[PDB]
Amino acid sequence: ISPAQQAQADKRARDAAAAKRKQDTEVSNAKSREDIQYTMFVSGLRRGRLNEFERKNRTDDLAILFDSVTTHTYTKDYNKSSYAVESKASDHVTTQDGKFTFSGT
Amino acid sequence: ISPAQQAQADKRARDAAAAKRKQDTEVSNAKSREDIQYTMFVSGLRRGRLNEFERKNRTDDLAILFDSVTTHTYTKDYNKSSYAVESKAKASDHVTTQDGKFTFSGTVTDSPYLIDPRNMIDRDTDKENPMLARRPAKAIEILELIADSHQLVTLVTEDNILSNYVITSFQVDRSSEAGSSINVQVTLEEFRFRTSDPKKAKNANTGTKQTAEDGAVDDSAKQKRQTPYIGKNAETKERWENAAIGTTD
Amino acid sequence: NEFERKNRTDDLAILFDSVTTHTYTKDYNKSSYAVESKASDHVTTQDGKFTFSGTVTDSPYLIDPRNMIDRDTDKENPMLARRPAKAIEILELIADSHQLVTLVTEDNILSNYVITSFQVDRSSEAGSSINVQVTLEEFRFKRTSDPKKAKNANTGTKQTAEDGAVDDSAKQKRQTPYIGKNAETKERWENAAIGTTD
Amino acid sequence: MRAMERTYTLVIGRPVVIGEKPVNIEKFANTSKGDAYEIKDLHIEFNVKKDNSKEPNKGYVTVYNLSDEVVNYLSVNQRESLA
Amino acid sequence: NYGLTGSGFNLPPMDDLVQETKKTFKSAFGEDFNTESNSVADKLIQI
Amino acid sequence: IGAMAANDPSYGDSLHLKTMPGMVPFAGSDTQRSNAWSRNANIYRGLYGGGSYIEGKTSSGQYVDVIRFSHWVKFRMEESVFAYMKRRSDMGLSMKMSDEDLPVLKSVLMNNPINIGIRNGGILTGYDTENKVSYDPTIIIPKRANIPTNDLAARILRDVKVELVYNNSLHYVKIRASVVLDR
Amino acid sequence: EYQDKVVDVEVSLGTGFETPMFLAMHGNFPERIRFYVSTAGMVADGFAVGSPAYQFATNAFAGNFAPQRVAIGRMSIDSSKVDFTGTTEQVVVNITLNKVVKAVKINVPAQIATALADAVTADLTGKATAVATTYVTVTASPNVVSVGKGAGVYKIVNESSETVATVLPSVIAENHNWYFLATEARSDADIVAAAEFAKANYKLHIYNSTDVDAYAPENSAASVFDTLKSLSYDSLGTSDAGADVDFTEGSVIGAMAANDPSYGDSLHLKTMPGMVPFAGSDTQRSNAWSRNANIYRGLYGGGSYIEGKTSSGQYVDVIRFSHWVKFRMEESVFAYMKRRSDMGLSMKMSDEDLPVLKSVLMNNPINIGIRNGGILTGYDTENKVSYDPTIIIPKRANIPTNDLAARILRDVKVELVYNNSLHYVKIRASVVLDR
Amino acid sequence: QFKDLLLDPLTGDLDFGTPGDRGMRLALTNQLSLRQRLYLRFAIWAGDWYFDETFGFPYRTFVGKKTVKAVLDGRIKSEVRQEPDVLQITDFQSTMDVVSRSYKCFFTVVTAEGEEISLAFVGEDEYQYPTPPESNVQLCGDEGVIINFKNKLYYLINFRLPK
Amino acid sequence: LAQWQRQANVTGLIYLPVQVEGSQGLSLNTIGWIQKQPDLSYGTEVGQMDWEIGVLDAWLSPDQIQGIAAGITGLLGL
Question: How many beta-carbon pairs below 8 A join chains B and E?
Answer without folding.
Answer: 14
